[PDB]
Amino acid sequence: VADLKAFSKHIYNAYLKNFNMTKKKARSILTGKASHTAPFVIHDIETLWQAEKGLVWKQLVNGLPPYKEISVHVFYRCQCTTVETVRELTEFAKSIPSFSSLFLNDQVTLLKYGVHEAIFAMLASIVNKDGLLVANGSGFVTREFLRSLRKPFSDIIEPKFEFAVKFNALELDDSDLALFIAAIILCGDRPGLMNVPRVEAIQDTILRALEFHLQANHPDAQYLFPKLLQKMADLRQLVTEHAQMMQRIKKTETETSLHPLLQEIYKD
Ligand SMILES: O=C(O)CCCCCOc1ccccc1CN(C(=O)c1ccc(-c2ccoc2)cc1)C1CC1
Ligand SMILES: CCCCCCCO[C@@H]1O[C@H](CO)[C@@H](O)[C@H](O)[C@H]1O
Ligand SMILES: CCCCCCCO[C@@H]1O[C@H](CO)[C@@H](O)[C@H](O)[C@H]1O
């Protein structure tokens, strides 16, 4: 048990070193306790335009694919963030010694099949029932606005809110999440994995570490560990549905570009 604390703290440090925003930072912004200035609320076309003229985005607008329409534009911003988060997750995983010890092709397999599950878990951190943070916490896009986008773009967004609000009710902190996300990435079930026994062994250790961490950090929280195992299963279903919806976008939205890295993740 005492051995897992060291293991856990290293994973937490990898998390702190590699992710742009913590849940702690996100919730302070969402509750209006973080700074002297509040996020700019994006809730319609006019405010989206004002945000693109005003807020500082990690990805410059000029850099996005040529403009098509509002729903597609919002989709392109979603892809921006997805790809950036894949980069952060890759570095997080590499800051974990037992992941970096795997052959590079298994690293790629784990990331390919794990990153969307991790993304949608981490998404909950910047979400509340009314919308989500964008542009490093400088903006807040309302759930209502995102609902108003045309199908298929509104359809691919709303189920993530449904998941997030339920996930946030578990009240995990950043140290819980670091272990949770590591367990999603270090998953021995992924297709085409070469060294399955090594990955299963690492996953098992992470989950033992997660169990012990939760007993210490959430001493009154009954059933939290099994609840999180179930959330892992729920994320797999969420990502299956997500991938199906992405296949439909590829089929029916032929004018919409998909980022080369995401094409490789979704290469069927
Ligand atoms: O599958 C892929 O990899 C790309 C396809 C993802 C499509 C589904 O993206 C969703 C769905 C639900 C909730 C959040 C996102 C995307 N997202 C975001 O952080 C995000 C959301 C909205 C905006 C935005 C900017 C201006 O107006 C709106 C910017 C960023 C986080 C998952 C990474
Ligand atoms: C940056 C980490 C995340 C990478 C995710 C993208 C993985 O794409 C896959 O790359 C493999 C190695 O090139 C190919 O053999 C596969 O066909 C392809 O699907
Ligand atoms: C083709 C559709 C493109 C939609 C917009 C996606 C842009 O994503 C950005 O592309 C860069 C180049 O890889 C990454 O380095 C950044 O991290 C990422 O934020």
From Swiss-Prot:
Main location: nucleus
One Gene Ontology term, aspect cellular component: chromatin
Keyword field contains Calcium: no
Post-translational modifications: 'Lys-48'-linked polyubiquitinated; leading to proteasomal degradation. Deubiquitinated and stabilized by OTUD3.
Disulphide connectivity of cysteines: none
Start and end residues of each NR LBD domain: 40-268
Top-level lineage group: Eukaryota
GO biological process: one example: cellular response to lipopolysaccharide
Gene Ontology molecular function, alphabetical: DNA binding; DNA-binding transcription factor activity; DNA-binding transcription factor activity, RNA polymerase II-specific; DNA-binding transcription repressor activity, RNA polymerase II-specific; linoleic acid binding; lipid binding; NF-kappaB binding; nuclear receptor activity
Tissues in which the UniProt entry reports expression: Ubiquitous with maximal levels in placenta and skeletal muscle.
Key words of the record: Activator, DNA-binding, Metal-binding, Nucleus, Receptor, Transcription, Transcription regulation, Ubl conjugation, Zinc, Zinc-finger
Subcellular locations according to the entry: Nucleus
Similarity remark: Belongs to the nuclear hormone receptor family. NR1 subfamily.
Job description of the protein: Ligand-activated transcription factor key mediator of energy metabolism in adipose tissues. Receptor that binds peroxisome proliferators such as hypolipidemic drugs and fatty acids. Has a preference for poly-unsaturated fatty acids, such as gamma-linoleic acid and eicosapentanoic acid. Once activated by a ligand, the receptor binds to promoter elements of target genes. Regulates the peroxisomal beta-oxidation pathway of fatty acids. Functions as transcription activator for the acyl-CoA oxidase gene. Decreases expression of NPC1L1 once activated by a ligand.
Self-association state and partner proteins as the record states: Heterodimer with the retinoid X receptor. Interacts (via domain NR LBD) with CRY1 and CRY2 in a ligand-dependent manner.
Entry protein name: Peroxisome proliferator-activated receptor delta
Organism of origin: Homo sapiens (Human)
